[PDB]
Design a protein around this ligand. Structure first.
Ligand SMILES: *[C@@H]1O[C@H](CO)[C@@H](O)[C@H](O)[C@H]1NC(C)=O
Length: 365
């Protein structure tokens, strides 16, 4: 898979964009799903609008042809959405065009075939009816998990994109529920948050990085996925966020050997909701949202723009896992994730970052 380093660098630029905006808010998104969403949308666009999207998704058009990109994305969607997939995630993309627009079939069918997404037709004249139709589709798609995603629609909304993703993975090495107890999470020097802290003594692929000045924990999910947590040292979060590059992450993933440790990891449920129009606008994706948008591939009768693009990622880190291990005699280091930390979810075989985020406060819904 040759598109991974682009998704990786797209993830970091998208992350640092959000980290630059807010200092003390939870960051959590899926750069794979977001990229997929707009890689799929790239079929409907043409000319400069088409070029602006991919280049904004961190793809040099000359270095990697679009024909090769789209199948590269399809290979991920194939890997994620499998039969008997123990990843246990429900990602899905929903297009919502206004009834009356004569839609191009070429686009619609490639949305279903190449990207396994699904487009719908809705009456945007009725705002509340549309809002419900969007959120019910998401509620349907996420098995009732994500609800009331779209809080508002514009009066002249013509084409709305919505990209949800839920993930409740199980660890290869579970934490004990009895061990989990209430502990303080130091969000900053003043704010302190009581959180259910999971904790297990055992062998973890955990190493204190000197390059990042951070404790770097790696935990294998059940099924082909891995969770990399980065716990920065005292006042090194800024340093950490800057120093992270795909070359560095891969350098940790390929490290296998473990170390005995007394880990404190917070049980949490974080949701990141993002107006992609606003967020990707900062990264460079702007013309598709503008009036002069080349969406002739979607519909060629009337002019069109992507009037709304929303994304909501939901994570559930909890103690549950699968159904031996020997610990050395030495005193294990007590690595506590009680202060804000960055983390990624990487798909094992493609090495693509499903999720990325920073926990500022676990109780922040
Ligand atoms: C990853 O999944 C493949 C099948 O999709 C399996 O053969 C392999 O053992 C898995 N590897 C790990 C490390 O989970």
């Amino acid at each position: 898979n040759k598109i991974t380093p682009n998704l990786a660098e797209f993830a970091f630029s998208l992350y640092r964009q959000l980290a630059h905006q807010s200092n003390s808010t939870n960051i959590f998104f899926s750069p794979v799903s977001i990229a997929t969403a707009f890689a799929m949308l790239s079929l409907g666009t043409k000319a400069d609008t088409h070029d602006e999207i991919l280049e904004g998704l961190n793809f040099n058009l000359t270095e990697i042809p679009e024909a090769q990109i789209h199948e590269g994305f399809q290979e991920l969607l194939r890997t994620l959405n499998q039969p008997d997939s123990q990843l246990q995630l429900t990602t899905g993309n929903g297009l919502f065009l206004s009834e009356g627009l004569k839609l191009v079939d070429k686009f619609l069918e490639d949305v279903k075939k190449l990207y396994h997404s699904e487009a719908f037709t809705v009456n945007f004249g009725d705002t509340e009816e549309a809002k419900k139709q969007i959120n019910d589709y998401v509620e349907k798609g996420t098995q009732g998990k994500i609800v009331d995603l779209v809080k508002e629609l514009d009066r002249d909304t013509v084409f709305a994109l919505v990209n949800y993703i839920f993930f409740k993975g199980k660890w290869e090495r579970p934490f004990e529920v009895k061990d989990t107890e209430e502990e303080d999470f130091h969000v900053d020097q003043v704010t302190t948050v009581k959180v259910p802290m999971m904790k297990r003594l055992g062998m973890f692929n955990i190493q204190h990085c000197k390059k990042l000045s951070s404790w770097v924990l790696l935990m294998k999910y059940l099924g082909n996925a891995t969770a990399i947590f980065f716990l920065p040292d005292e006042g090194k979060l800024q340093h950490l966020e800057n120093e992270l590059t795909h070359d560095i992450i891969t350098k940790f993933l390929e490290n296998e050997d473990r170390r005995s440790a007394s880990l404190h990891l917070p049980k949490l449920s974080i949701t990141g909701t993002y107006d992609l129009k606003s967020v990707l606008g900062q990264l460079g994706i702007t013309k598709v949202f503008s009036n002069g948008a080349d969406l002739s591939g979607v519909t060629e009768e009337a002019p069109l723009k992507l009037s709304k693009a929303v994304h909501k990622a939901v994570l559930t880190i909890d103690k549950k896992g699968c159904e031996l291990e020997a610990i050395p005699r030495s005193i294990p280091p007590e690595v506590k994730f009680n202060k804000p930390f960055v983390f990624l979810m990487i798909e094992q075989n493609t090495k693509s970052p499903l999720f990325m985020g920073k926990v500022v406060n676990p109780t922040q819904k």
